[PDB]
Amino acid sequence: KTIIINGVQFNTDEDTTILKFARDNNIDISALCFLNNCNNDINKCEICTVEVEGTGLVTACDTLIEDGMIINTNSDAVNEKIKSRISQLLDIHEFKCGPCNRRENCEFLKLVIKYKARASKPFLPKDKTEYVDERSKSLTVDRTKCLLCGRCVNACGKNTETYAMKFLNKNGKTIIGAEDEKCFDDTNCLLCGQCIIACPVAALSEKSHMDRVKNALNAPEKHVIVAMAPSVRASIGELFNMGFGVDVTGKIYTALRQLGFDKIFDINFGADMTIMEEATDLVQRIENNGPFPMFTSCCPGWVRQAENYYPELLNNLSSAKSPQQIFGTASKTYYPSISGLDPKNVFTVTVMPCTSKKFEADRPQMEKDGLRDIDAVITTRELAKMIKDAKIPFAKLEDSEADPAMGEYSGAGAIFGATGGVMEAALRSAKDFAENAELEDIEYKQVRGLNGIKEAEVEINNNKYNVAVINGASNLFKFMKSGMINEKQYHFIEVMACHGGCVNGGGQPHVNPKDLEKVDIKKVRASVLYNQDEHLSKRKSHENTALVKMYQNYFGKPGEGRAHEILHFKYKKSAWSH
Ligand code: 402
Ligand code: SF4
Ligand code: SF4
Ligand code: SF4
Ligand code: SF4
Ligand code: FES
C-alpha cells in the first residue's frame, strides 16, 4: 500500500487503523472516545477526525488504512470540527476546575487546552444533587463531568462482561448508570471500580472515606491504626511524578507517620494470616477430600460475582477472611491484648488499590462485640490526595519501617497483589503443612503471568492435584460458561476480579492512555512485588515471627476453635423460595 499523511509518504503492509498507523509513527492524532481498542459506537466523539482526500472528514479510530489515501491531520476543517465537538462537550461540562479531583491528570482539560475551546453557554447548575449519585458504598457518579464517553461502559463490558454500567434514557436525557438507575450495590455490579479507571474525567470516583479518617485522627480518644495493601507500595509513587515501578514503602511509612497515624502496620501481615488459615483448611480439605474445589475469598469483587452469578459456589469459598478483614479482626482483639488499648477506642484504616474493599468493610456481619473489623478504607488516590493536602514532600522522604507487631511480613504475602500470587503463597505453605517438611523450592512460576486462565499441576505429598488461577471477572465467566470447570477435577482455584491482580484495581492511579502504549502497567507494578518476594529472607507466611508469636500467645492453632470462630467468615446462599 501507499499512504500520504501530512504530505509524507509511507509504504507499508499493515492492516490497521489510521490512528494506530499514525501513532506507530510520530503523527499526532488527538483521541477521547478511543480506549481498550474500542470507541463509542453510537455518539462518536469525532476527536480523532482526519481528512481523507476524496472522502472527506473521517474518524481515524475505526477507519482502516487503504492505498491511494492522502490524509490530513491538521487542516482548517479538521480543527474546526474538533474545536466544535469540544465546545459542544463544554456546553454540558461544569468546568469548574475549582475543587476538581482529576485536575492534575484530566484528559478533557488537556484537549480543551490543546484546541483552546470555549463553551457557548457555560454549564453552571444551582443544585447538583440531581447530577450526583453517592448511594453506593464503593462508587460515586458526577454527571456534571460526564462526556457521554462510553469508555466506562466498554471497560465494564470487557473486564467483567456484566454490563453493570449501562446507557440509560433518564427522562429525556441520556446518562450512564446501573439497572433502572438503582444503586450499584443493589445490582449485579462487582464494585471492581474498573469503570473509574477508564474514565477520563471526574465523572466516576470512589466513595470517599477521607473525612472518616480525619474525624478519627483528630478524635482524642481514638487510636488510629493504618495498614496498606501489597499493591499500594508499588503504585502510589506514580501520583507523585516518581515514575513507574518504584518501591516507595519506606516513604509511605514516613508519610503515614507524618499524617498523624498512631500505628503503622501492613496488610501483608494479614495476607500471611490468610495464607495460614487458607493453607490449613486446604489440607484438612485434602484428607477429607472435599468439598472440592476450594475457591479463594479474598477478592470482594469475585465474592459479589459469585453471589450474583454462581451462589452455588459460595459453599466452596474458603471461610478464611480476606487479609483486610482478617487484619481488622486481629487489630480489635489481639492488638489490644499486646497494647493495652480499649478495643472500642481502636480505629483501623486500610490503604487499598480496590474500591470493592469499601463494600467489604461495611458488611453488616463484619463485626464482633459491636466492634467493626475495618472502620475506614481509603484508596491509593485518596491517600495521595491526603498526602498532598498536607503538603508532604513525598518524593523526598526518607525510609521508615512499620511497627513489627502486625507490620512485618513474608515474601509469600508480598506477591498477593499480583495475579497468581495468592496461589503461589498458598502452595508454599500448604505443601509444607501436608508433608511436614520445610521445603526449599517455593517458586511456582506457571501460575504467574497475564494470561486469562492459568492452569497448573502440583504434587503435595506424593499426590497430584490440579490448580487454576482466574485472572479477571470475564475470565471467570468464560471459565464457567465454557465448561472448563467440569473438565478435570480442580482442587484449588484463585479468582481476581481485576485482570492482572490487585495492582490493577479500581482505586489505582489513573494512567494516561498515552503512557499505556509505552508501559505494561500490570507487569511493571507486579515487578516490585515479585522482587520484594525474593529479596526477603522469610518467604513463607508461617515464617513470619510476629505472626507466629500472635498464633502461640492468642489465637492458638489455626483452623481450629478460637482461630476458626474469630478469624473466619463464610457465605450462605439464600434458601430456595418463590
Ligand atoms: N485484603 C486484601 Fe489483598 C491483600 O493483602 C489487597 O490488599 Fe489485594 C492487593 N494488593 C487488593 O485490594 S485483595 C484479593 N487478593 C490479593 S491482594
Ligand atoms: S474533570 Fe477535568 S476537565 Fe472536568 S472540570 Fe475537572 S479538571 Fe476540568
Ligand atoms: S463516566 Fe467517564 S468514562 Fe463513562 S461515559 Fe462519562 S466521561 Fe466517559
Ligand atoms: S465496578 Fe466493575 S462491574 Fe461495576 S460498573 Fe464498574 S467495571 Fe462494571
Ligand atoms: S482483583 Fe484486587 S483490586 Fe480487583 S476487585 Fe479483586 S481485590 Fe479489588
Ligand atoms: S476516538 Fe474516534 S470517534 Fe472517538
XYZ file of C-alpha atoms and ligand atoms in Angstrom:
631
model
C 0.000 0.000 0.000
C 0.844 3.682 -0.254
C -0.285 6.244 2.317
C 0.220 10.005 2.339
C -0.074 11.676 5.737
C 0.553 15.428 6.007
C 2.463 15.195 2.727
C 4.790 12.453 3.943
C 4.716 9.133 2.072
C 4.574 5.782 3.868
C 4.973 2.331 2.331
C 3.532 -0.475 4.450
C 1.555 -3.714 4.524
C -0.067 -3.386 7.949
C -3.866 -3.638 8.015
C -4.731 -1.362 10.940
C -6.455 1.962 11.603
C -5.320 5.455 10.628
C -4.966 6.407 14.300
C -2.836 3.360 15.123
C -0.675 3.658 11.998
C -0.083 7.356 12.661
C 0.778 6.742 16.328
C 3.203 3.995 15.338
C 4.901 6.865 13.574
C 5.088 10.352 15.089
C 1.892 11.741 13.613
C -0.152 13.168 16.481
C -3.869 12.439 16.468
C -5.987 13.505 19.431
C -8.448 10.946 20.783
C -11.004 10.872 23.585
C -13.517 8.214 22.648
C -10.965 5.519 21.806
C -9.738 3.179 24.550
C -9.271 -0.592 25.032
C -9.376 -0.832 21.218
C -12.984 0.334 21.318
C -14.888 3.529 20.587
C -18.342 4.864 21.438
C -20.187 3.245 18.535
C -23.270 5.442 18.999
C -22.300 9.058 19.659
C -18.708 9.063 18.393
C -16.636 11.892 19.856
C -15.038 12.568 16.462
C -11.979 13.962 18.257
C -9.837 11.675 16.082
C -11.163 13.379 12.952
C -8.837 13.463 9.941
C -9.306 14.345 6.270
C -9.113 11.718 3.530
C -8.759 13.259 0.077
C -11.750 12.088 -1.945
C -13.854 11.059 1.036
C -13.837 13.947 3.498
C -13.677 14.012 7.287
C -13.439 10.552 8.859
C -12.780 9.109 12.318
C -9.290 7.585 12.445
C -10.265 5.297 15.347
C -12.389 2.975 13.231
C -11.137 3.673 9.710
C -8.839 1.129 8.056
C -5.876 2.460 6.081
C -6.020 1.913 2.314
C -3.834 2.576 -0.723
C -4.371 5.879 -2.511
C -5.244 7.660 0.730
C -3.989 11.194 1.284
C -4.613 12.099 4.920
C -4.619 15.480 6.649
C -4.498 15.649 10.447
C -4.217 19.414 10.919
C -6.147 21.153 8.142
C -8.518 24.030 8.955
C -11.626 21.875 8.509
C -10.333 19.175 10.864
C -9.513 21.552 13.697
C -12.765 23.477 13.308
C -14.509 20.120 13.621
C -12.583 19.107 16.738
C -12.911 22.556 18.329
C -16.625 22.325 17.564
C -17.028 18.932 19.260
C -15.016 20.019 22.312
C -17.028 23.238 22.654
C -20.193 21.133 22.479
C -18.766 18.941 25.238
C -18.049 22.036 27.330
C -21.663 23.137 26.870
C -22.635 20.237 29.147
C -19.488 20.192 31.275
C -19.188 22.014 34.583
C -15.647 23.195 34.005
C -15.235 24.484 37.477
C -11.679 23.155 37.919
C -12.270 24.802 41.273
C -12.109 21.857 43.640
C -11.899 19.087 40.994
C -10.190 15.812 41.900
C -8.951 14.982 38.382
C -7.274 18.349 37.990
C -3.647 17.235 37.796
C -4.346 14.484 35.253
C -7.520 15.245 33.289
C -7.649 14.300 29.597
C -10.571 16.574 28.754
C -8.786 19.576 30.261
C -5.813 18.562 28.106
C -7.983 18.565 24.967
C -9.583 21.915 25.821
C -6.163 23.439 26.481
C -4.831 21.920 23.254
C -7.513 23.282 20.928
C -8.277 26.330 23.083
C -12.035 25.709 23.021
C -14.706 27.692 24.863
C -18.353 26.860 25.542
C -21.200 28.892 24.053
C -23.175 28.671 27.290
C -21.166 27.841 30.452
C -22.799 24.924 32.284
C -23.458 26.013 35.886
C -26.372 24.388 37.776
C -27.845 25.776 41.017
C -28.022 22.363 42.696
C -26.095 19.225 41.697
C -27.969 16.842 43.967
C -29.750 15.772 40.776
C -26.482 15.038 38.939
C -24.700 13.226 41.775
C -25.062 9.590 42.862
C -23.365 8.740 46.170
C -25.682 5.989 47.392
C -23.013 3.362 46.784
C -20.503 2.165 49.364
C -17.892 1.975 46.586
C -18.923 4.289 43.743
C -19.832 7.926 43.179
C -21.072 9.464 39.932
C -20.830 13.132 38.925
C -22.731 13.614 35.660
C -21.800 17.298 35.623
C -18.467 15.916 34.422
C -19.606 13.062 32.174
C -18.913 13.357 28.456
C -21.302 10.557 27.455
C -17.988 8.969 26.592
C -18.895 5.277 26.627
C -15.413 4.308 27.823
C -16.698 3.210 31.241
C -19.431 1.116 29.610
C -16.934 -0.624 27.322
C -14.423 -1.160 30.120
C -17.086 -2.807 32.280
C -18.132 -4.757 29.212
C -14.697 -6.256 28.587
C -13.358 -6.604 32.130
C -16.441 -8.117 33.752
C -18.833 -8.882 30.880
C -21.624 -7.907 33.279
C -22.530 -4.556 31.723
C -23.370 -3.182 35.164
C -22.508 0.180 33.632
C -25.201 0.972 31.060
C -26.508 3.816 28.960
C -29.866 4.980 30.291
C -32.707 7.113 28.973
C -33.299 9.166 32.126
C -36.491 11.136 31.374
C -35.368 12.667 28.083
C -31.632 12.834 28.753
C -29.013 10.183 28.009
C -26.970 9.254 31.090
C -24.843 6.387 32.378
C -25.569 4.256 35.427
C -26.936 0.947 36.666
C -30.028 -1.182 36.025
C -33.088 1.118 36.242
C -30.632 3.690 37.654
C -30.712 1.956 41.020
C -27.680 1.929 43.308
C -24.810 -0.228 42.035
C -24.666 -2.137 45.325
C -28.242 -3.253 44.633
C -27.310 -4.731 41.242
C -25.080 -7.420 39.746
C -22.221 -4.888 39.716
C -18.969 -6.189 41.219
C -17.872 -2.787 42.541
C -14.467 -3.512 40.978
C -14.246 0.156 40.039
C -12.733 -0.562 36.633
C -15.330 1.943 35.457
C -13.354 4.651 37.242
C -10.049 3.516 35.745
C -11.220 4.047 32.162
C -12.868 7.393 32.910
C -11.026 10.482 31.575
C -12.816 12.928 33.899
C -14.104 13.247 37.470
C -17.460 11.757 36.479
C -16.653 8.446 38.151
C -14.957 8.353 41.536
C -14.617 6.129 44.577
C -16.857 6.661 47.592
C -14.593 8.790 49.788
C -13.698 7.720 53.334
C -11.192 10.522 53.970
C -13.282 12.618 56.354
C -13.919 9.317 58.121
C -10.154 9.072 58.646
C -9.604 12.656 59.745
C -12.528 12.666 62.203
C -10.755 9.731 63.844
C -7.264 11.251 63.674
C -8.490 14.377 65.462
C -10.666 12.463 67.918
C -8.751 12.499 71.233
C -9.703 9.030 72.464
C -9.392 7.404 69.038
C -6.251 5.328 68.429
C -5.886 5.189 64.652
C -4.112 2.177 63.136
C -3.183 2.193 59.442
C -2.129 -0.670 57.163
C -1.592 -0.631 53.390
C -2.210 -3.250 50.694
C 0.623 -5.018 48.796
C -0.058 -3.081 45.574
C -0.037 0.402 47.117
C 3.718 0.310 47.768
C 4.314 -0.224 44.054
C 1.860 2.283 42.606
C 1.366 5.459 44.650
C 4.771 6.795 43.587
C 3.323 7.388 40.132
C 0.975 10.045 41.508
C 3.989 11.936 42.838
C 5.717 12.010 39.452
C 8.292 9.425 40.550
C 7.832 7.093 37.575
C 6.524 3.560 37.023
C 7.587 0.580 39.137
C 9.183 2.332 42.102
C 9.259 0.871 45.608
C 8.193 3.660 47.973
C 7.397 1.533 51.040
C 9.568 3.478 53.493
C 8.344 6.760 52.034
C 4.776 5.592 52.579
C 5.510 4.650 56.194
C 7.080 8.067 56.734
C 4.113 9.875 55.160
C 1.650 7.896 57.269
C 3.602 8.776 60.406
C 3.595 12.403 59.271
C -0.175 12.286 58.759
C -0.890 11.667 62.437
C -1.327 7.903 62.304
C -0.698 6.352 65.714
C 0.258 2.880 64.491
C 1.892 1.805 61.240
C 1.222 -1.787 60.208
C 0.763 -3.611 56.903
C -1.952 -5.690 55.241
C 0.705 -8.139 54.003
C 0.828 -9.425 57.588
C -2.865 -10.175 57.195
C -2.038 -11.800 53.865
C 0.263 -14.111 55.780
C -2.624 -14.753 58.199
C -4.976 -15.527 55.325
C -2.335 -17.915 53.997
C -2.024 -19.657 57.385
C -5.761 -20.210 57.563
C -6.288 -20.949 53.862
C -3.435 -23.461 53.601
C -4.587 -25.169 56.774
C -8.203 -25.544 55.585
C -6.832 -26.570 52.192
C -5.122 -29.576 53.800
C -7.995 -30.569 56.118
C -9.984 -30.277 52.906
C -7.427 -32.667 51.453
C -7.648 -35.806 53.676
C -11.401 -35.253 53.850
C -11.071 -34.902 50.062
C -13.906 -32.433 49.965
C -15.652 -30.250 49.439
C -13.658 -29.811 46.211
C -12.795 -27.463 44.722
C -11.855 -24.607 47.048
C -12.090 -21.054 45.719
C -10.288 -18.060 47.186
C -12.425 -15.499 49.000
C -10.001 -12.580 49.311
C -11.314 -10.640 46.311
C -14.603 -8.873 47.222
C -15.388 -8.400 43.525
C -15.153 -12.128 42.895
C -17.231 -12.660 46.043
C -20.024 -10.369 44.814
C -19.716 -12.041 41.418
C -20.267 -15.448 42.984
C -23.224 -14.139 44.995
C -24.795 -12.647 41.862
C -23.969 -15.360 39.293
C -22.818 -18.593 40.958
C -24.180 -18.669 44.513
C -23.932 -22.480 44.405
C -20.194 -21.846 44.698
C -20.485 -19.829 47.913
C -20.028 -23.021 49.926
C -16.840 -23.824 48.014
C -15.364 -20.492 49.073
C -12.816 -20.540 51.885
C -14.252 -19.478 55.244
C -10.990 -17.617 55.899
C -11.438 -13.838 55.941
C -9.661 -11.634 53.400
C -6.327 -10.060 54.503
C -8.083 -6.740 55.145
C -10.869 -8.212 57.264
C -8.664 -10.811 58.946
C -6.316 -7.966 59.879
C -9.204 -5.903 61.204
C -10.372 -8.852 63.279
C -6.991 -9.216 64.976
C -6.489 -5.479 65.480
C -9.664 -5.310 67.598
C -8.885 -8.430 69.621
C -5.224 -9.459 69.636
C -3.719 -5.994 69.258
C -5.372 -4.612 72.405
C -4.039 -7.725 74.163
C -0.497 -6.543 73.417
C -1.011 -2.781 73.603
C -3.455 -2.338 76.477
C -5.790 -0.237 74.347
C -9.539 -0.231 74.916
C -10.564 -2.002 71.682
C -13.585 0.315 71.316
C -11.141 3.206 71.019
C -9.268 1.464 68.202
C -9.816 2.721 64.638
C -8.445 0.583 61.785
C -7.733 2.151 58.382
C -6.609 0.216 55.307
C -4.990 1.653 52.193
C -6.222 -0.278 49.166
C -5.917 -0.383 45.350
C -9.506 -1.609 45.340
C -12.910 0.045 45.689
C -14.871 -3.105 46.495
C -12.969 -3.289 49.786
C -15.190 -0.424 50.918
C -18.278 -2.575 50.389
C -16.447 -5.425 52.109
C -15.625 -3.360 55.201
C -19.199 -2.086 55.554
C -20.839 -5.517 55.543
C -23.277 -5.891 58.484
C -21.730 -9.138 59.746
C -18.157 -7.825 59.727
C -18.427 -7.231 63.488
C -17.914 -8.742 66.897
C -18.987 -7.277 70.227
C -20.389 -4.318 68.272
C -16.858 -3.531 67.107
C -16.138 -3.290 63.369
C -13.291 -5.158 61.681
C -12.336 -2.291 59.391
C -13.647 1.170 60.253
C -12.435 3.045 57.169
C -10.957 2.196 53.758
C -9.151 4.710 51.540
C -7.756 4.068 48.064
C -4.337 4.854 46.614
C -5.694 8.040 45.048
C -7.296 9.023 48.351
C -4.017 8.501 50.220
C -2.238 10.535 47.541
C -4.648 13.450 47.940
C -4.490 13.141 51.727
C -0.707 13.456 51.433
C -0.737 16.387 49.003
C -3.239 18.431 51.043
C -0.811 18.059 53.952
C 1.837 19.342 51.514
C 4.068 16.386 52.399
C 7.115 16.262 50.058
C 6.617 12.524 49.481
C 9.209 12.030 46.747
C 11.988 13.223 49.067
C 11.032 11.444 52.299
C 13.448 9.029 53.975
C 12.517 5.416 54.639
C 10.880 4.341 57.864
C 9.746 0.898 58.955
C 6.275 -0.068 60.111
C 5.579 -1.404 63.576
C 6.610 -5.081 63.697
C 3.779 -6.468 65.892
C 1.427 -6.717 62.902
C 3.575 -4.992 60.305
C 6.388 -7.303 59.225
C 5.606 -9.852 56.511
C 6.943 -12.670 54.342
C 7.635 -12.842 50.616
C 4.561 -15.001 50.099
C 2.263 -12.238 51.318
C 4.236 -9.674 49.329
C 3.045 -11.082 45.997
C -0.668 -11.221 46.853
C -1.155 -8.058 44.810
C -0.360 -9.891 41.585
C -2.440 -12.480 39.755
C -1.340 -15.950 40.832
C 0.256 -14.546 43.969
C -2.361 -15.931 46.342
C -1.977 -19.285 44.589
C 1.802 -19.387 44.971
C 1.761 -18.111 48.558
C -0.850 -20.717 49.469
C 1.064 -23.559 47.798
C 4.354 -22.733 49.532
C 2.732 -23.198 52.939
C 0.179 -25.912 52.150
C 2.896 -28.202 50.812
C 4.998 -27.841 53.960
C 1.868 -28.408 56.039
C 0.832 -31.630 54.312
C 4.342 -33.080 54.047
C 5.575 -31.948 57.472
C 8.735 -30.613 55.842
C 10.389 -27.246 55.302
C 10.798 -27.439 51.523
C 13.236 -25.197 49.677
C 11.849 -24.721 46.157
C 8.914 -22.338 46.539
C 8.618 -20.503 43.216
C 5.518 -21.607 41.313
C 6.003 -19.798 38.024
C 3.266 -21.456 35.954
C 0.523 -19.561 37.779
C 2.238 -16.246 37.044
C 1.683 -14.021 34.022
C -1.068 -12.013 32.350
C -2.835 -14.939 30.672
C -6.589 -15.052 31.284
C -6.992 -18.602 32.550
C -3.880 -20.230 34.005
C -3.676 -23.921 34.872
C -1.060 -25.982 36.689
C -0.489 -29.387 38.272
C 1.302 -29.687 41.609
C 2.131 -32.672 43.812
C 1.509 -32.166 47.518
C 2.903 -35.152 49.434
C 3.295 -37.732 46.661
C -0.182 -36.973 45.319
C -1.031 -34.805 42.329
C -3.644 -32.058 42.349
C -4.833 -29.558 39.747
C -4.920 -25.840 40.483
C -6.250 -22.930 38.430
C -5.766 -19.157 38.545
C -8.510 -16.998 37.049
C -7.330 -13.537 36.030
C -10.314 -11.237 35.501
C -14.075 -11.472 36.070
C -14.770 -12.004 32.373
C -12.333 -14.909 32.541
C -14.332 -16.409 35.394
C -17.441 -16.094 33.248
C -15.566 -17.825 30.433
C -14.077 -20.488 32.728
C -17.539 -21.424 33.994
C -19.698 -20.953 30.881
C -17.327 -22.803 28.537
C -17.405 -25.828 30.833
C -13.710 -25.787 31.723
C -14.664 -26.323 35.369
C -16.277 -29.678 34.553
C -13.248 -30.851 32.587
C -10.885 -32.119 35.235
C -11.381 -32.228 38.982
C -9.971 -28.943 40.271
C -8.734 -28.689 43.840
C -7.712 -25.076 44.439
C -8.801 -22.096 42.349
C -7.843 -18.415 42.568
C -10.122 -15.697 41.182
C -9.291 -11.991 40.855
C -11.879 -9.548 39.500
C -9.267 -7.214 38.041
C -7.134 -8.511 35.180
C -3.534 -8.621 36.399
C -4.352 -8.794 40.097
C -4.928 -6.061 42.673
C -2.157 -3.994 41.054
C -4.812 -3.023 38.509
C -7.637 -2.152 40.896
C -10.418 0.407 40.589
C -8.723 2.568 43.204
C -5.374 2.667 41.410
C -3.680 5.738 39.843
C -5.223 6.745 36.509
C -2.678 6.173 33.762
C -2.850 8.336 30.635
C -3.908 6.386 27.521
C -0.650 7.841 26.180
C 1.646 6.241 28.647
C -0.067 2.843 28.238
C 1.452 2.182 24.772
C 4.816 2.531 26.476
C 4.337 0.805 29.824
C 2.848 -2.579 30.623
C 1.364 -1.142 33.812
C 0.387 -4.574 35.178
C 3.780 -6.252 34.782
C 5.644 -3.116 35.851
C 3.576 -2.832 39.020
C 3.898 -6.572 39.715
C 7.690 -6.477 39.305
C 8.184 -4.612 42.590
C 6.164 -7.233 44.452
C 7.980 -10.176 42.890
C 11.337 -8.581 43.750
C 10.317 -7.821 47.324
C 9.432 -11.521 47.482
C 12.848 -12.878 46.576
C 14.918 -10.299 48.452
C 13.051 -11.081 51.675
C 14.695 -13.671 53.929
C 11.421 -15.115 55.207
C 9.430 -16.129 52.123
C 6.603 -18.112 53.709
C 3.641 -16.928 55.763
C 4.324 -19.476 58.507
C 7.815 -17.968 58.815
C 6.558 -14.568 59.944
C 7.859 -14.338 63.512
C 5.305 -11.723 64.589
C 2.539 -13.864 63.126
C 3.839 -16.988 64.849
C 4.062 -15.144 68.188
C 0.483 -13.986 67.654
C -0.645 -17.556 66.981
C 1.045 -19.052 70.050
C 0.022 -16.377 72.552
C -3.529 -15.537 71.432
C -5.114 -17.488 68.565
C -3.747 -20.940 69.351
C -3.509 -23.323 66.406
C -5.106 -22.191 63.084
C -8.251 -23.625 61.509
C -9.491 -24.606 64.968
C -11.754 -23.445 67.798
C -10.607 -19.930 68.662
C -8.839 -19.270 65.365
C -11.825 -20.595 63.426
C -14.524 -18.800 65.427
C -12.820 -15.403 65.331
C -10.775 -15.361 62.096
C -13.338 -16.857 59.702
C -16.393 -15.730 57.734
C -18.484 -17.916 55.424
C -21.096 -17.024 52.812
C -24.551 -18.599 52.852
C -26.651 -18.841 49.697
C -30.250 -17.654 50.007
C -32.557 -20.592 50.720
C -34.941 -21.663 47.959
C -38.097 -19.560 47.636
C -40.660 -18.489 45.033
N -7.266 -7.707 51.541
C -6.655 -7.953 50.611
Fe -5.428 -8.436 49.198
C -4.029 -8.425 50.278
O -3.162 -8.467 51.083
C -5.170 -6.492 48.847
O -4.995 -5.933 49.888
Fe -5.416 -7.060 47.046
C -3.854 -6.125 46.869
N -2.811 -5.503 46.778
C -6.400 -5.627 46.984
O -7.173 -4.685 47.127
S -7.133 -8.464 47.662
C -7.667 -10.081 46.838
N -6.297 -10.686 46.820
C -4.854 -10.425 46.598
S -4.100 -8.909 47.353
S -12.945 16.787 35.407
Fe -11.095 17.572 34.299
S -11.948 18.770 32.533
Fe -13.675 18.468 34.018
S -13.631 20.358 35.336
Fe -12.364 18.771 36.418
S -10.216 19.166 35.700
Fe -11.605 20.280 34.243
S -18.455 8.399 33.165
Fe -16.411 8.947 32.274
S -15.833 7.109 31.014
Fe -18.080 6.928 31.437
S -19.086 7.913 29.622
Fe -18.875 9.550 31.228
S -16.880 10.577 30.728
Fe -16.884 8.575 29.591
S -17.341 -1.681 39.291
Fe -16.795 -3.265 37.724
S -18.769 -4.395 37.349
Fe -19.328 -2.440 38.412
S -19.796 -0.978 36.710
Fe -17.579 -0.679 37.245
S -16.454 -2.063 35.799
Fe -18.656 -2.733 35.771
S -8.677 -8.112 41.958
Fe -7.918 -6.929 43.782
S -8.314 -4.739 43.241
Fe -9.571 -6.007 41.789
S -11.621 -6.173 42.802
Fe -10.425 -8.014 43.446
S -9.448 -7.393 45.432
Fe -10.148 -5.466 44.418
S -11.834 8.491 19.213
Fe -12.657 8.050 17.224
S -14.782 8.604 17.384
Fe -13.997 8.796 19.432
